Amino acid sequence: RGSHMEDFVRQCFNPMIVELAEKAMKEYGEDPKIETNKFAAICTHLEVCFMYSDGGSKHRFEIIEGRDRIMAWTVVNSICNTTGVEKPKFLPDLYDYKENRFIEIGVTRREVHIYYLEKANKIKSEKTHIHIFSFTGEEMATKADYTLDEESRARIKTRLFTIRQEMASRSLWDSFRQSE
Ligand SMILES: COc1cc(CCNC(=O)c2[nH]c(-c3ccc(C(F)(F)F)cc3)nc(=O)c2O)ccn1
Ligand SMILES: [Mn+2]
Ligand SMILES: [Mn+2]
Asked: Which residues participate in catalysis according to the annotation?
């Protein structure tokens, strides 16, 4: 199954980001060859998480996304057990040592409010931080604390819009938006 979407996502994203997305989808029983929109979304979320951890100081974050399930949970346990913070029900994306909390990164093709409320209804023990970026260039964070510098968030927003543009130039953006 040779799709324009798959070749585009391989030309658009870092080879390592691509490999991590592939491993994560296959672990979840999904096929990147034939479920290509989801492959692109997973790559995008990955790159945003990495970009985000690159903001701030150097020892600041611990990266949870992009690991295998078992080691990601091992790090989450080490975090909770050394810092005393409650253990979250679901695997988050990062941990901020500077503010001592987990961070849940979201990336949506819809309005950021709906995505935020969705991600908030499934974490009832609401001690973790939610930060949502949209494809159109806005964002929303818990208690209005956007964690990072303005320049770092701006780099992320520019990147998401460049992805969206380049997708739309190949007429793949419509199928991507109308797929979430
Ligand atoms: C959810 O199923 C999955 C899950 C995995 C590994 C664990 N996942 C996350 O931790 C995660 N996953 C997503 C996500 C997943 C799929 C889509 C899709 F495909 F619908 F566009 C969009 C967002 N967003 C996040 O913010 C986030 O933290 C691997 C594969 N599939
Ligand atoms: Mn995650
Ligand atoms: Mn996330």
From this structure: 65, 93, 119
